Amino acid sequence: RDCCTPPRKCKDRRCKPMKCCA
Structure with a gap:
């Protein structure tokens, strides 16, 4: 979150797995 x-x-x-980062 955030x-x-x-x-x-x-x-x-x-x-980290979040699409925005990767």
Whole structure:
């Protein structure tokens, strides 16, 4: 939750597979 919201974060585990990051 709360990661792709600009600017991106993609720090959390669940936020890495997220399409916005990858």
